[PDB]
């Protein structure tokens, strides 16, 4: 399953100019575009090699879409402050995520279009891409405006087709790096803690895509509750890193195994110290 996803953030700052607008776009876990209204020269910028070749006409068109979206987001921020009867001095945040999912066969499996206000769910296109789910009474104002305006049908028209067409084109242009899976490079380290406890840490480095499962077992039984897991983190070269730790009784290290599951592995890995 592949996907193309867009992430928009608008932040007000009363007394210090107009709201700032930031957009980024991903294919799977690979970023390919960014826009920042506060940039020195605000324009759509490439973040991936398979869009560097698209031509100035394409990049002029993406730049214009972001500049128009930024101005609409400013209006939305002003409307939202009114809905909630909020002071004109406070700074507020509007976020939007939308995109499409190209199911394993290569069709259009799923689309989505969701908004949050000040870090909380506000309004969202439901899975059928026809109805809306509003979080409160202020979001019901937006739902009434968009249903009478037939907003959902326009977004569906994009998520179906247009979103899918760009996605398929991007996967063909960047096939060398988007349709590959790099397996994790693994190892286990050992740290004494006390005169009777020690930490075992299972490492996964350089893998892609970001999805992965690391689980510590004892005598073959999983131990989800006593396993410390860090959030998967970017290495900076397009790949990801993760680790998982468990504190074990000294003398019993050989009873523990780390199990690694990832798309690039033919079989799940079993590691021991």
């Amino acid at each position: 399953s592949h996907s193309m996803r867009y992430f928009y953030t608008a932040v007000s700052r009363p007394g210090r100019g107009e709201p700032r607008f930031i957009a980024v776009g991903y294919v799977d876990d690979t970023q390919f575009v960014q826009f920042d209204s506060d940039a020195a020269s605000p324009r759509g910028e490439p973040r991936a090699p398979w869009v560097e070749q698209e031509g100035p006409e394409y990049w002029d068109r993406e730049t214009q879409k972001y500049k128009r979206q930024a101005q609409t987001d400013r209006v939305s921020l002003r409307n939202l402050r009114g809905y909630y009867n909020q002071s004109e001095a406070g700074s507020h945040t509007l976020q939007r995520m939308y995109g499409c999912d190209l199911g394993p066969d290569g069709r259009l499996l799923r689309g989505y279009n969701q908004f949050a206000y000040d870090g909380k769910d506000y309004i969202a296109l439901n899975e059928d891409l026809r109805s809306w789910t509003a979080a409160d009474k202020a979001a019901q104002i937006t739902q009434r405006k968009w249903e009478a305006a037939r907003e959902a049908e326009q977004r569906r028209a994009y998520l179906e087709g247009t979103c899918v067409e760009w996605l398929r084109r991007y996967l063909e242009n960047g096939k060398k790096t988007l349709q590959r899976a790099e397996h994790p490079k693994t190892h286990v380290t050992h740290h004494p803690v006390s005169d009777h406890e020690a930490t075992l840490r299972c490492w996964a480095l350089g893998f892609y895509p970001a999805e992965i499962t690391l689980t510590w077992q004892r005598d073959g039984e999983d131990q989800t509750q006593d396993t410390e897991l860090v959030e998967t983190r970017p290495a900076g070269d397009g790949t990801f890193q993760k680790w998982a730790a468990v504190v074990v009784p000294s003398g019993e290290e050989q009873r523990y195994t780390c199990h690694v599951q990832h798309e690039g592995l033919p079989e799940p890995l079993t590691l021991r110290w």
């Binding site: 409307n79 939308y98 305006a149």
Partner: peptide, 10 residues
């Protein structure tokens, strides 16, 4: 290819 602005602001 990003989506164009819709029918209305929020």
């Amino acid at each position: 290819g990003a989506d164009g602005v819709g029918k209305s602001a929020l």
